[PDB]
């Protein structure tokens, strides 16, 4: 037997091991101290996900930068969200977020980070903003705090979710107080989110491409 | 054979010292020992059984049996009753022996 | 350890082995977790036959009265019928009557057997008034014991007399449910009834 | 004679109209009502057997070939279901079969899914190969629990189960219950995919059968169970 | 004054319509209802006798001749039922009589089978021969519990019971309850066959009766009993 | 109709059927009577329910025979002992008011 | 079988017509009635969270900006709600804002007052000022709990709450529940009055924002609660 595959064979011969094998399990000696990792532990780490845009063209309620559903680690060209999840179809995992926005001192404007949890994004309806403010959020006052921490345990209707197709949480950064512009200083403070993934499960195999 | 399978195992435990994960030593090899085990077991176990049934005055010697193959929990009887015409049983044991007519007139 | 048809021992089955390995799904470690409250009988017998529905039938032409005695097939049955093989049980009948605005009455009972003349009220009666609810339970007996053929069907008869008359039309309904089925069931589940040959 | 007396109950949250149900029933919890007729009660006997059982899933648990025309065949003419393992197919990456998928299979699980609709549990499958004692061969069995459109050697990716024939048959591979939620719909919603793949040939000698084959029958258990009834049906059948 | 209160019962599984039955009754389990009128209760006395009894089968248990025209006869004219044991019939293998079969017999078992339909138990039979003290003779009695169409000396096969007359009559032969199932139908479904067979003659002297005869009456018991009622009937009578 | 007729009803689940409805249940409610049922749950695939499907379901209503005049029905709902929690509150701010 | 028996209940204070209610319900105290269908009962699981809660006022208790067009604005265009604290307004006795009053505020308290109508509790308010770190300033906040028509420096009379900005925001001032009776109507009956008043300027340096501002969001709690339902509504919305 091996993972997911049994081999039933009817006419064995013999184990046939070479000498006193006692095989390991570094080593060490050492072989590049990095251990081990993932997947178990490489598939889960912070990662970049964002970009640049700003200035004054944005009224307060004007959207900013939406960060994609769990598909966004898959279609990311780097970590697991590519190798292993391009094998298996099923994903269940928590989520951990650090969002970074650094401005140049002397200016003030607010950023808002909310994690809608798949509420049929319907049309959000137009007066519902507060509303939008009851959720597991985070309100950055850029005058001082230059980074912001967030932790989302995922909740979704189903007990599992298809890898790239059926999603769950969608980050949205909305502006709050369009930014103030002293004359004069740089016009763009951009944005970044760097993520990390908790103890993570793939299940239910399927052929390569699908 | 027998010890070799457990040698595949003892290799597995060779790499099991790695809790990862957990392990049991990809892929579930934790059994390469087989089910006691590639031998023999039943099928051509032959003689693999030989049978030699018996009935009154007639023996049946058959060389390649399969299986008893009973339907569910048969517990078969032996009225009943419930009752099925109270007469029991009879002969032969007891019908063959009773008074009978044998005669005539003159 | 991988079975062998036409080999030992019986009609039982097994634990089907605790393979894979693990792995982590992958082969086993399947432990049952009861989701419901748990009545759990949804998989079990009794309950299911405990529910009812069945035949929606037996329209009625007014003229005149008498009977005709109708043969309850027991199946049918024909809606939840997907379930069976076996023989027996001690019914629970539901009767309904749609007729003249509270004008009239309906007498009903069963049965047994072949035929009669006769005064029906002897073998029983159950005066059900106009526009009322569908309520009886019968027990059994001769009813020659021996259980019941299983696909007669279904060994029986109902007897329905609509008494007087109100000059307009008349209609009835018959639902069935059999409770605490002894059933066992017996000799399961031969009559594979895989017809599907629908 | 006025107590009181009795006065009163007067709930009645009703509407004395079922009350006596109709409606009809659910979930039993309504025993022999407006009794009765009358009175005593019966006293049966076997046999039969001492087989009084609930379950249900005990009556599933019986290996039953999949339909007739699955492939289809039987006759239809020969095959002689299971296709044929017959030399020419070599190329260790091939064979033939197919699911799509499903749950029909009409060996009485048709009728289960034609009365209940929901469940959880696996579909233990059996392949059984028939050939004489001389010739031998190996072959695998792919099954994906999702599943997709055909879909090649990823059958090497997914689940496996090697096959040697042999002395003697038959075989087995299981599936664990794989899906989101907990219940699944029992109609044409979803299930997996199944091939048999010849890897090495099934050889033959100069006195031999030269043609060897399969039959495949599934069953559900032993973890399984069904939830809730429904009217369905297949008309009727 | 609201408790609560009372609120509530509201079952009602009803439909307050029998409820008070009608329907009618079965199985009693409905005593004096919507009482009453009123009130106390009576205090009777015998006699009569101290004969308060259920049963039923106690009132069967009474030997009663079979109808009138069974053979028929009585008068009808003479016979004088039971045919005649009268010299000429010798040939030790003969006599006359016949069942077909049955259960009518109209000595009140007519009315039993005309109200109940089912039962289990035997039909204890009596033959009673009348002749003076001088003459003597033997004769047998065949009965088959199935039964068939006449059907000769197999009456030597089946049950027996020898008869000597005698001092003094009468006689008896029983039957055990013989059939499949447990209950039997009480209408014209089935029963056995009955002859009386002269083996030796019933002789006579020069001062003697020269003609001697029979009467035959059955009854049911003591193991018996009846199951369930039915309306029947014989119109009415 | 003045005490003329009956109404059969039950639910549900799922997609479609042919069929004899009385299988999945029945509740014969007579003319001019009171509005009474409680359902429990089950497949009903567990996983809770979308929340704004809506609302995941179906009712099935068959008015049996016919009395040649018109006919009318009413449906009220109340959900008891809500497990609800409720879960993920109280996101769907539904501040629509955008009425 | 007459006991008695049963005879009787016969309250019935009814009228077996709800009885089974309809009517409809109030106040629950009517559980799963004419059961049921059937039978058992479910066994759910998280997650979710281990969040099974009543309340209600736990779901109020969340600071939520007041509408969109309050002032109105947002956009509407800028402001950019909260007006603007911007130099020119000095004269330590001024500023701008206003209530009238009220309870809309449509951050979901709209829906509360659109289902319940009555309550008791305060409206904890927050002002939050945004400016960079350099510039600084003080300003007050008037609120009268009655209230009147605008209505000047009596805002110096009534409640107060000084404001320094700062490192760092935001702020708070509460109100105790103030009214006669105990409940209050939740429609357009009454509430207070609210200004923000610039006393000293919010200064600016030669490299600075030069324009600084506010947002104001209220919430109700933690003493609060609601009494009785009503149909309302806002159509619907």
Author numbering:
A (entry chain C): 73 to 282
B (entry chain C): 20 to 125
C (entry chain A): 24 to 221
D (entry chain B), E (entry chain B), G (entry chain B): 20 to 256
F (entry chain A): 123 to 221
Give the text the authors published on this PDB structure.
However, an emerging pathogen, human parechovirus 3 (HPeV3) can cause severe central nervous system infections such as meningitis, and is a leading cause of neonatal sepsis. We utilized cryo-electron microscopy and image reconstruction to analyse the structure of HPeV3 on its own and in complex with a human monoclonal antibody Fab. The HPeV3 capsid is composed of 60 copies of three β-jellyroll proteins, VP0, VP1 and VP3 in a T=1, pseudo T=3 arrangement. The virion structure shows that VP1 pocket-binding drugs, such as pleconaril, are unlikely to bind to HPeV; that VP0 is an important protein for stabilizing the inner surface of the capsid, and finally, that the assembly of HPeV is most likely controlled by multiple interactions of the genome with the capsid, through conserved amino acids in VP1 and VP3 and stem-loop structures in the RNA.
We determined a 4.3 Å resolution HPeV3 structure using electron cryo-microscopy and single particle analysis. Homology models of capsid proteins VP0, VP1 and VP3 were used as starting models to generate an atomic model of HPeV3 constrained by the density from the reconstruction. Unusually for a picornavirus, we showed by polyacrylamide gel electrophoresis protein analysis and from the structure, that VP0 does not undergo autocatalytic cleavage into VP4 (N-terminal) and VP2 (C-terminal) in the virion. Similar to many picornaviruses, HPeV3 possesses an open channel at each fivefold vertex and a canyon for potential receptor and antibody binding, however, it is wide and shallow. Five VP3 N termini come together to form an annulus at the base of the channel, giving intra-pentamer stability. Instead the VP0 N terminus straddles an adjacent threefold on the inner surface of the capsid, forming a loop that stabilises the twofold-related VP0 from another pentamer (pentamers 1 and 3), a conformation that has not been previously observed to our knowledge. Unusually, about 25% of the genomic RNA is highly ordered, and at high occupancy in the reconstruction. Finger-like RNA densities come into close contact with capsid proteins VP1 and VP3 around the vertices that could accommodate about 30 nucleotides. Moreover, we identified the conserved regions in the N terminus of VP3 (T20-R26, T47-T65), hZ helix and the βIC terminus regions of VP1 (R202-N205) as the structured RNA interaction sites. We revealed the unusual stability of these capsids at the intra-pentamer level by VP3 interactions and at the inter-pentamer by VP0, and propose that the uncoating mechanism of the HPeV genome will be significantly different to that of other picornaviruses.
